[PDB]
């Protein structure tokens, strides 16, 4: 990070400006909200218009039917009609309970996904976002969140001749955290996400058992950090 | 218009083409693949293309392309680093 | 000492797409009835639009649970890994398609409903590319560690693909490295044995096959509610038609079609509370195919019974297994 603090801080405005774009382009890019919503006042115009229909009764003005029959007809009548309507309501109000328990499963995940990707960092891929997860920034939305997740990705990359470990007096080396590869003739340890030139060294690396065992084991030298200094 | 299980003699009684999930009328089959838009069934999928030559307009119905195909070169001692 | 015990989890995904035409199934594609039903209202639109709902919910549910990578990927056809043996888990050439002997043999350990407006709409996602889809995984998991998932493949040793793996257990890669030959057979037995449990007992296989069995059961029940009279005087519409007359006629067939209706509501609300269950299982079978099939997760007893190493994932009919 201190060697590319400008580099990463101008990417990540880069980022945000293209986020800009990408939200202020086109409108099915936020489509989850608009889903519900949708489909919310959607599903409440259908309840709203049942109202028109008969249901088999007289007709469907209610007062009307008030004014045309007389109660010992009407009794029957209006049975129909309410009964009719008390199905329709029920119909609605039981698709209304299911998607609010899909709603309810909906939040419980965002309270899970604001309490690690913001609250802290979840190291679970693909969780977060697509590649390795930094942070999130919450920000509203009209009866909705919405999450800019920052990842980490690799960009560029470029393969090399590795090695399972090394024995420097037969004795088998194994990185402390790193991949034994060689540019060239000369090999180097780094980290598994990133390119890091490394001379080998006994911190790098742990040593333990011998060769003769291990699979693919190269013979390479094992430089020592203390003979340089006990020399003068 | 998409037909679900009228395996698409009976239509009439213009361009037909089959799927497991019945035929399309009014549909260009095209072998070049292309991640779709419009799922219309057994991975078979719709889409609308502008051309310039005949037809500047068409209805497009495609085997979906599952991705781009990338083969990975593996072996035994070669390692790719994110550099 | 220890073991590797391979383990078979096994997740539905998604229902079978049953739709529904109101026309033809409440009413005998009669005149008088059609009248009647849009007499009612707008209750067959609302069916038609909640069946088209949780197809379009199916759909989601299998892409979101499977498409988790873009690239499709090819596994190399030589087999060194470090004496890891794959083959019952890569994609078999001769198969009729590009599958594994693994869900060849779950394929056969799992199990009238038409002419009625019972059209079961096609899968989006045929056998073949969920398949395709699962070999690609596959070849992401063993020849890209778990960086594939994160942004574009990286070759990795598959050795050290499981040193890694280990070293983030918390055991440390000398084991592996003075074991692999030894771990190498541990794996070709454990497969062993769970091949030839697949093959022998299907009663661990419940999860699908019950899902499959309670779909079906619904959906016949619903066919065979027509049969009944819920109050009418005749099972067949038409036998009504025959003789009774408009006075009587319109009475009966409006008990007899908000019977029928109301058959049909009950079902489609069954269908409501079991596509959303198996969507919430869903979404756990996509966060298992992220949290450890394109890694390994640090927390226990989520993906595997003990110390998580790695995940294959194969296909079947409407569901997905986990070899953890
Ligand atoms: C690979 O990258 C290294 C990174 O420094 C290059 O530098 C070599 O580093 C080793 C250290 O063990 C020195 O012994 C060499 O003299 C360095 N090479 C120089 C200075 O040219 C290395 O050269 C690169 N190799 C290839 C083949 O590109
Ligand atoms: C690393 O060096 C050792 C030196 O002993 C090599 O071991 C010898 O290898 C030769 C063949 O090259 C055999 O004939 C000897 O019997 C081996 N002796 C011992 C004591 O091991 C070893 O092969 C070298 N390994 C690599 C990868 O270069
Ligand atoms: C640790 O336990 C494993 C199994 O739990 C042992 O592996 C067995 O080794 C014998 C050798 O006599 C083989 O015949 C078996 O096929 C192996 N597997 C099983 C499941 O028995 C292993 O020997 C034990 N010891 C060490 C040091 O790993
Ligand atoms: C992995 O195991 C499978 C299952 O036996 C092997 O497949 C067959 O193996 C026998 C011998 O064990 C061969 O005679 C057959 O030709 C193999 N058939 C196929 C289709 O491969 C497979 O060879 C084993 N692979 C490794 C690398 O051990
Ligand atoms: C590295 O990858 C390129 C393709 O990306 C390939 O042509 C080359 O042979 C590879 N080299 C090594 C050493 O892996
Ligand atoms: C259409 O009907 C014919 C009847 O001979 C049948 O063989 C065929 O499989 C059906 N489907 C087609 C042609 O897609
Ligand atoms: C598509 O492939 C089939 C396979 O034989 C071939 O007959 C047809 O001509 C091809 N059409 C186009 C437009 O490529
Ligand atoms: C190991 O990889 C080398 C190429 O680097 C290849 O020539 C050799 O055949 C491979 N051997 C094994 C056992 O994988």
Same mark, same amino acid.
């Given at each position: 990070?201190?060697?590319?603090?400008?580099?990463?801080?101008?990417?990540?405005?880069?980022?945000?400006?293209?986020?800009?774009?990408?939200?202020?382009?086109?409108?099915?890019?936020?489509?989850?909200?608009?889903?519900?919503?949708?489909?919310?006042?959607?599903?409440?115009?259908?309840?709203?218009?049942?109202?028109?229909?008969?249901?088999?009764?007289?007709?469907?003005?209610?007062?009307?039917?008030?004014?045309?029959?007389?109660?010992?007809?009407?009794?029957?009548?209006?049975?129909?009609?309410?009964?009719?309507?008390?199905?329709?309501?029920?119909?609605?109000?039981?698709?209304?309970?299911?998607?609010?328990?899909?709603?309810?499963?909906? @939040?419980?995940?965002?309270?899970?996904?604001?309490?690690?990707?913001?609250?802290?960092?979840?190291?679970?891929?693909?969780?977060?976002?697509?590649?390795?997860?930094?942070?999130?920034?919450?920000?509203?939305?009209?009866?909705?969140?919405?999450?800019?997740?920052?990842?980490?990705v690799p960009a560029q990359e470029k393969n090399?001749?590795? @090695?399972?470990?090394?024995?420097?007096?037969?004795?088998?080396?194994?990185?402390?955290?790193?991949?034994?590869?060689?540019?060239?003739?000369?090999?180097?340890?780094?980290?598994?996400?990133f390119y890091?030139?490394?001379?080998?060294?006994?911190?790098?690396?742990?040593?333990?058992?011998?060769?003769?065992?291990?699979?693919?084991?190269?013979?390479?030298?094992?430089?020592?950090?203390?003979?340089?200094?006990?020399?003068? | 218009?998409?037909?679900?299980?009228?395996?698409?003699?009976?239509?009439?009684?213009?361009?037909?083409?089959?799927?497991?999930?019945?035929?399309?009328?009014? @549909?260009?089959?095209?072998?070049?693949?292309?991640?779709?838009?419009?799922?219309?069934?057994?991975?078979?999928?719709?889409?609308?293309?502008?051309?310039? +030559?005949?037809?500047?307009?068409?209805?497009?119905?495609?085997?979906?392309?599952?991705?781009?195909?990338?083969?990975?070169?593996?072996?035994?001692?070669?390692?790719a680093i994110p550099t | 000492?220890?073991?590797?015990?391979?383990?078979?989890?096994?997740?539905?995904?998604?229902?079978?797409?049953?739709?529904?035409?109101?026309?033809?199934?409440?009413?005998?594609?009669?005149?008088?009835?059609?009248?009647?039903?849009?007499?009612?209202?707008?209750?067959?639109?609302?069916?038609?639009?909640?069946?088209?709902?949780?197809?379009?919910?199916?759909?989601?549910?299998?892409?979101?649970?499977?498409?988790?990578?873009?690239?499709?990927?090819?596994?190399?056809?030589?087999?060194?890994?470090?004496?890891?043996?794959?083959?019952?888990?890569?994609?078999?050439?001769?198969?009729?398609?590009?599958?594994?002997?693994?869900?060849?043999?779950?394929?056969?350990?799992?199990?009238?409903?038409?002419?009625?407006?019972?059209?079961?709409?096609?899968?989006?996602?045929?056998?073949?590319?969920?398949?395709?889809?699962?070999?690609?995984?596959?070849?992401?998991?063993?020849?890209?560690?778990?960086?594939?998932? @994160?942004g574009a493949?990286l070759?990795?040793?598959?050795?050290?693909?499981?040193?890694?793996?280990?070293?983030?257990?918390?055991?440390?890669?000398?084991?592996?490295?003075?074991?692999?030959?030894?771990?190498?057979?541990?794996?070709?037995?454990?497969?062993?044995?769970?091949?030839? +449990?697949?093959?022998?007992?299907?009663?661990?296989?419940?999860?699908?096959?019950?899902?499959?069995?309670?779909?079906?059961?619904?959906?016949?029940?619903?066919?065979?509610?027509?049969?009944?009279?819920?109050?009418?005087?005749?099972?067949?519409?038409?036998?009504?038609?025959?003789?009774?007359?408009?006075?009587?006629?319109?009475?009966?067939?409006?008990?007899?079609?908000?019977?029928?209706?109301?058959?049909?509501?009950?079902?489609?609300?069954?269908?409501?509370?079991?596509?959303?269950?198996?969507?919430?299982?869903?979404?756990?079978?996509?966060?298992?195919?992220?949290?450890?099939?394109?890694?390994?997760?640090?927390?226990?007893?989520?993906?595997?019974?003990?110390?998580?190493?790695?995940?294959?994932?194969?296909?079947?009919?409407?569901?997905?297994?986990?070899?953890?």
């Open positions: 990070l201190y060697e590319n603090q400008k580099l990463i801080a101008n990417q990540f405005n880069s980022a945000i400006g293209k986020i800009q774009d990408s939200l202020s382009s086109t409108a099915s890019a936020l489509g989850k909200l608009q889903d519900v919503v949708n489909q919310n006042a959607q599903a409440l115009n259908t309840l709203v218009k049942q109202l028109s229909s008969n249901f088999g009764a007289i007709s469907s003005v209610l007062n009307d039917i008030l004014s045309r029959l007389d109660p010992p007809e009407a009794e029957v009548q209006i049975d129909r009609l309410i009964t009719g309507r008390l199905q329709s309501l029920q119909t609605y109000v039981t698709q209304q309970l299911i998607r609010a328990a899909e709603i309810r499963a909906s @939040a419980n995940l965002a309270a899970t996904k604001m309490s690690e990707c913001v609250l802290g960092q979840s190291k679970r891929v693909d969780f977060c976002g697509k590649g390795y997860h930094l942070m999130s920034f919450p920000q509203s939305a009209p009866h909705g969140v919405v999450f800019l997740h920052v990842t980490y090399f001749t590795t @090695a399972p470990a090394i024995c420097h007096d037969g004795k088998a080396h194994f990185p402390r955290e790193g991949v034994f590869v060689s540019n060239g003739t000369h090999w180097f340890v780094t980290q598994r996400n890091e030139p490394q001379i080998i060294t006994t911190d790098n690396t742990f040593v333990s058992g011998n060769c003769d065992v291990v699979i693919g084991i190269v013979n390479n030298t094992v430089y020592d950090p203390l003979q340089p200094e006990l020399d003068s | 218009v998409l037909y679900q299980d009228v395996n698409c003699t009976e239509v009439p009684v213009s361009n037909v083409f089959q799927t497991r999930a019945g035929c399309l009328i009014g @549909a260009e089959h095209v072998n070049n693949s292309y991640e779709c838009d419009i799922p219309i069934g057994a991975g078979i999928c719709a889409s609308y293309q502008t051309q310039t +030559s005949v037809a500047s307009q068409s209805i497009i119905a495609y085997t979906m392309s599952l991705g781009a195909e990338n083969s990975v070169a593996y072996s035994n001692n070669s390692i | 000492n220890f073991t590797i015990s391979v383990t078979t989890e096994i997740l539905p995904v998604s229902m079978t797409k049953t739709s529904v035409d109101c026309t033809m199934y409440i009413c005998g594609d009669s005149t008088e009835c059609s009248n009647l039903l849009l007499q009612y209202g707008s209750f067959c639109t609302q069916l038609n639009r909640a069946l088209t709902g949780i197809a379009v919910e199916q759909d989601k549910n299998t892409q979101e649970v499977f498409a988790q990578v873009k690239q499709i990927y090819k596994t190399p056809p030589i087999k060194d890994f470090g004496g890891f043996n794959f083959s019952q888990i890569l994609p078999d050439p001769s198969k009729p398609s590009k599958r594994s002997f693994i869900e060849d043999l779950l394929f056969n350990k799992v199990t009238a409903q038409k002419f009625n407006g019972l059209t079961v709409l096609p899968p989006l996602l045929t056998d073949e590319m969920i398949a395709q889809y699962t070999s690609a995984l596959l070849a992401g998991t063993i020849t890209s560690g778990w960086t594939f998932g @994160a493949a070759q990795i040793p598959f050795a050290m693909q499981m040193a890694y793996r280990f070293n983030g257990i918390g055991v440390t890669q000398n084991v592996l490295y003075e074991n692999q030959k030894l771990i190498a057979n541990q794996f070709n037995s454990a497969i062993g044995k769970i091949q030839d +449990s697949l093959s022998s007992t299907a009663s661990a296989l419940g999860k699908l096959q019950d899902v499959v069995n309670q779909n079906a059961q619904a959906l016949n029940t619903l066919v065979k509610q027509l049969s009944s009279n819920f109050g009418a005087i005749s099972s067949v519409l038409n036998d009504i038609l025959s003789r009774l007359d408009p006075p009587e006629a319109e009475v009966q067939i409006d008990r007899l079609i908000t019977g029928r209706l109301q058959s049909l509501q009950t079902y489609v609300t069954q269908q409501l509370i079991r596509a959303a269950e198996i969507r919430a299982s869903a979404n756990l079978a996509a966060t298992k195919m992220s949290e450890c099939v394109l890694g390994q997760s640090k927390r226990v007893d989520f993906c595997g019974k003990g110390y998580h190493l790695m995940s294959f994932p194969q296909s079947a009919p409407h569901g997905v297994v986990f070899l953890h």
